[PDB]
Structures are given as C-alpha cells and as structure tokens.
Amino acid sequence: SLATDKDKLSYSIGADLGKNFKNQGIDVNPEAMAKGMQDAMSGAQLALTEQQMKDVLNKFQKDLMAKRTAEFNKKADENKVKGEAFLTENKNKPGVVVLPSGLQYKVINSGNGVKPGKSDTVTVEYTGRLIDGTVFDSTEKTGKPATFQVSQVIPGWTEALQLMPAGSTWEIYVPSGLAYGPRSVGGPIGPNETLIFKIHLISVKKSS
Amino acid sequence: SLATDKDKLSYSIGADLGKNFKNQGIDVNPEAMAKGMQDAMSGAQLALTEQQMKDVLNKFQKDLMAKRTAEFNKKADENKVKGEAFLTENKNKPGVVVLPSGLQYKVINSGNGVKPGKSDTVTVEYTGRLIDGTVFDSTEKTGKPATFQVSQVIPGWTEALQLMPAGSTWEIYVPSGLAYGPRSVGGPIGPNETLIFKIHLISVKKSS
Numbered sequence: 207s208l209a210t211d212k213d214k215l216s217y218s219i220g221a222d223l224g225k226n227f228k229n230q231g232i233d234v235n236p237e238a239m240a241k242g243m244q245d246a247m248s249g250a251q252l253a254l255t256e257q258q259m260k261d262v263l264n265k266f267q268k269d270l271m272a273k274r275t276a277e278f279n280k281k282a283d284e285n286k287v288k289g290e291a292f293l294t295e296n297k298n299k300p301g302v303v304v305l306p307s308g309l310q311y312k313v314i315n316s317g318n319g320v321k322p323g324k325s326d327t328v329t330v331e332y333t334g335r336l337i338d339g340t341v342f343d344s345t346e347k348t349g350k351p352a353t354f355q356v357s358q359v360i361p362g363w364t365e366a367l368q369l370m371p372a373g374s375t376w377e378i379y380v381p382s383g384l385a386y387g388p389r390s391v392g393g394p395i396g397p398n399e400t401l402i403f404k405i406h407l408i409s410v411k412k413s414s
Numbered sequence: 415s416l417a418t419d420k421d422k423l424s425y426s427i428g429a430d431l432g433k434n435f436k437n438q439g440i441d442v443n444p445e446a447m448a449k450g451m452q453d454a455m456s457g458a459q460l461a462l463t464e465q466q467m468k469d470v471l472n473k474f475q476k477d478l479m480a481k482r483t484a485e486f487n488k489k490a491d492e493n494k495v496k497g498e499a500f501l502t503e504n505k506n507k508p509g510v511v512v513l514p515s516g517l518q519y520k521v522i523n524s525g526n527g528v529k530p531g532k533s534d535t536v537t538v539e540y541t542g543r544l545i546d547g548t549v550f551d552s553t554e555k556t557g558k559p560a561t562f563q564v565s566q567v568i569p570g571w572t573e574a575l576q577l578m579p580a581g582s583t584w585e586i587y588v589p590s591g592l593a594y595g596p597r598s599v600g601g602p603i604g605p606n607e608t609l610i611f612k613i614h615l616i617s618v619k620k621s622s
C-alpha cells in the first residue's frame with residue numbers, strides 16, 4: 207500500500223523505470239535492484255566490488271548499443287526493401303517518369319511559368335506521405351504556402367523543382383538516398399524510407 | 415545472494431541509482447520502487463492512475479530543480495562573498511594595484527617590449543588558481559607556451575594584457591565579473607569564483 211507521497215513517488219519512479227526497461231528488452235530482477243539501491247543509500251558495503259560493478263555496467267552498455275544497432279540495421283533494411291518494391295511497381299504505372307538519379311514523378315497539371323534554378327527561391331503547397339499513406343507534413347495544415355531555396359531541401363526536391371514550370375502540380379516518389387537516408391534522430395521519418403510528395407510550385411524568385 | 419548476472423546486473427543498476435539518489439537528497443523507499451517496477455514489467459494494473467503518477471513525477475521535477483537552484487544560489491553567494499573578502503585584503507598588500515574594473519595586479523618582473531593591442535595575438539606561460547590555491551590550468555603542465563588573441567579570453571586577461579610590456583611577469587587577481595561569473599556548466603571553476611593568475615607575456619604579434 208502507498209499511503210505517503212514518499213511511497214507514491216518511489217512507486218511512480220519504479221513504474222517509469224520498469225516501463226522503460228520493459229520495452230527495451232532489459233530483463234531485470236526488481237528485488238535484487240531494491241537490495242542494491244538500499245545498500246547504496248544506507249552506506250553499507252555493496253555486495254560487489256567497485257570493479258565488478260564497473261564491468262557489469264560496461265558489459266551492459268556494450269550489449270545494449272549492439273542490440274539497438276541490430277534493430278536499427280534490421281529496420282533500415284526493411285524500409286529499403288519496401289521502398290525498392292514500391293518504386294519497381296511504380297515505374298510501370300501510367301504517366302510515371304524515372305530519372306537517372308532514381309527519382310520518379312508524375313505530372314498532375316503542367317504549368318506555363320519558368321523552371322526554378324539551383325539558387326532560386328520557391329513557394330509551394332505540398333503534402334508528404336510515407337509509402338503506407340502516413341502523412342508527415344503538409345502546408346494544408348498551415349493553411350498557407352511555404353517558401354524554400356531550391357538548394358536547401360532534400361535532393362529529391364532539388365532535382366524535381368528544377369524541372370517543374372511554375373504553376374505545375376506533380377507527384378514525386380523519392381528514394382531514400384534522395385531524402386533522409388539512414389535517419390536515426392527524427393521520429394516522423396524512419397531510416398531508409400522512400401517518400402511520396404504532392405508538390406504544387408506556385409512562384410519562383412531569383413536572388414542578388 | 416547474487417548468483418546470476420541478471421542479479422549482478424540488477425543489483426549494480428540499483429546501487430548506481432541509489433548512489434545518485436543518496437547524494438541528491440531524494441528520499442525514496444526501495445521496496446515501493448521495486449513494486450512499481452514489477453507492476454510495469456508484468457503488465458499489471460499500476461496502483462496509481464496515469465494521471466496521478468504524472469502529477470507525482472512533475473511535482474518531483476519541480477521540487478528537484480528548485481532544490482538545485484537554491485544550492486547553486488547558495489554557493490554562488492558564498493564564492494562571491496569569499497572573493498570580495500580576498501580582494502579587500504589584497505588591495506592593501508605591497509605592490510598591489512587596483513584598476514577601475516576591479517582587476518588587481520602586482521608586477522613581478524617588468525619587461526621592456528610592447529604592450530599588446532585588443533586585436534593582437536600573444537604567447538604566454540601561465541598558471542591559474544582558485545583563492546584556496548587549487549590550480550586549475552597551467553602551461554607548465556604542457557611544457558610549452560600558449561597562444562591567445564587578447565580579445566578572445568576572459569575580460570580580466572584582456573584588461574591585463576593590454577597593460578603588460580612583452581617580457582613581463584605579473585600576478586593578477588580577477589573578480590568573477592571579469593572571469594566566468596555565475597558559471598554552472600564546468601566543474602573546475604565554480605560560480606562567482608575570483609581567480610588568481612601568474613602570467614608571463616612572452617611575445618606579441620599583430621594581424622592583417
């Protein structure tokens with residue numbers, strides 16, 4: 207029973223830690239953990255030498271990073287394989303064009319304005335989704351267009367924008383190499399993920 | 415008893431956590447913590463609601479930062495008071511000169527070369543110590559001199575260098591305002607700490 211907040215806090219700390227252990231593969235014994243925490247807090251002689259524990263925890267970290275490196279490689283290869291399957295089927299579909307870099311696109315509506323240069327600025331309404339349809343960014347959520355310097359977005363966009371007349375709307379299919387490649391820092395887009403964009407290029411502006 | 419490495423690891427995790435709790439004021443009950451970790455790992459219904467725990471842990475963090483903010487303010491004011499006492503006694507000592515910025519210095523040996531400018535580069539052999547004599551940096555450990563642009567060191571050094579002829583050796587006493595002020599990121603130098611330097615200015619070089 208948890209009468210006091212010392213208990214409520216301790217329990218809450220334990221549950222948060224157990225939750226992080228549970229979904230990380232770390233198989234730990236809560237009773238042996240309580241004993242070592244108690245020995246540390248009481249100032250008693252710990253059951254392991256400073257050195258034994260150091261080896262214990264360093265092996266722990268070594269094994270942990272390896273487990274997390276294998277999972278990342280495993281997902282990186284699954285996405286890569288998924289993306290290739292997708293593009294292989296997509297190249298066959300009507301109106302799809304494949305470029306040397308592997309970028310694919312399909313003209314929805316062809317505009318009549320100018321093609322932007324690698325130093326230009328552009329205004330676009332866009333929507334981006336994973337292969338499974340999961341949308342991860344859209345200007346339609348902002349309710350207004352966005353502006354980018356063509357040379358300052360992912361390679362897939364840079365190669366696409368340079369081919370679109372202003373006023374056009376294209377769907378582009380971006381192999382991970384032209385996108386975020388082996389990403390391991392941002393949640394929305396996993397690693398080696400192929401991306402699908404609807405891009406409406408509104409306006410092009412040069413610079414000085 | 416800790417027969418297996420599951421136990422050795424768990425115990426070592428517990429001791430490391432208890433050690434970090436012990437010297438942080440966090441009074442926790444290891445048995446109530448083991449219960450909540452076990453409930454999390456087993457998938458059982460936790461004894462507190464998701465919300466109860468959230469309040470528990472957020473109050474915890476609030477109280478923690480405050481305790482750590484009060485300790486820092488307390489040490490910041492102790493160092494500041496120590497440093498002022500030191501400089502008040504030091505201004506009276508033979509050969510000590512006090513400048514408008516509060517910097518104090520004492521000529522050990524006067525050189526005959528040029529005074530460096532605020533854009534110059536200099537070569538110096540130096541030693542820096544806290545008020546209590548604790549040395550925290552020295553070129554005599556490197557065994558060779560160091561180079562700095564006068565405008566790119568702590569203000570105390572910038573105001574001192576501009577007054578020293580090359581070849582001179584001075585002791586300078588730097589109020590924390592001319593040093594690192596309320597530092598809270600680096601261990602060697604605490605906050606609001608007054609610093610004592612022996613500085614030998616070897617050579618001055620201009621720039622283009």
Ligand SMILES: O=C1[C@@H]2CCC[C@H]([C@@H](CO)CN1Cc1ccccn1)N2S(=O)(=O)c1cc(Cl)cc(Cl)c1
Binds near residue numbers: 359360386392
């Ligand atoms: O080049 C891009 C691409 C292409 C269109 C513009 C957006 C912005 C975010 O609004 C991210 N960039 C710019 C960029 C991102 C990373 C490094 C360098 N440049 N993205 S994005 O793919 O829609 C995107 C949007 C968001 Cl919110 C997160 C991520 Cl990880 C990716």
Ligand SMILES: O=C1[C@@H]2CCC[C@H]([C@@H](CO)CN1Cc1ccccn1)N2S(=O)(=O)c1cc(Cl)cc(Cl)c1
Binds near residue numbers: 567571
């Ligand atoms: O202005 C300084 C002063 C003055 C002499 C040169 C050294 C260097 C480190 O070798 C640090 N600097 C430069 C500096 C430090 C911080 C921000 C901007 N400039 N220090 S120092 O005071 O000896 C010093 C040395 C070391 Cl190792 C750590 C600290 Cl926190 C401070």
Ligand SMILES: [Zn+2]
Binds near residue numbers: 343344345347
């Ligand atoms: Zn957005």
Ligand SMILES: [Zn+2]
Binds near residue numbers: 307365
């Ligand atoms: Zn190209």
Ligand SMILES: [Zn+2]
Binds near residue numbers: 551552
């Ligand atoms: Zn050094």
Ligand SMILES: [Zn+2]
Binds near residue numbers: 515573
């Ligand atoms: Zn000045």
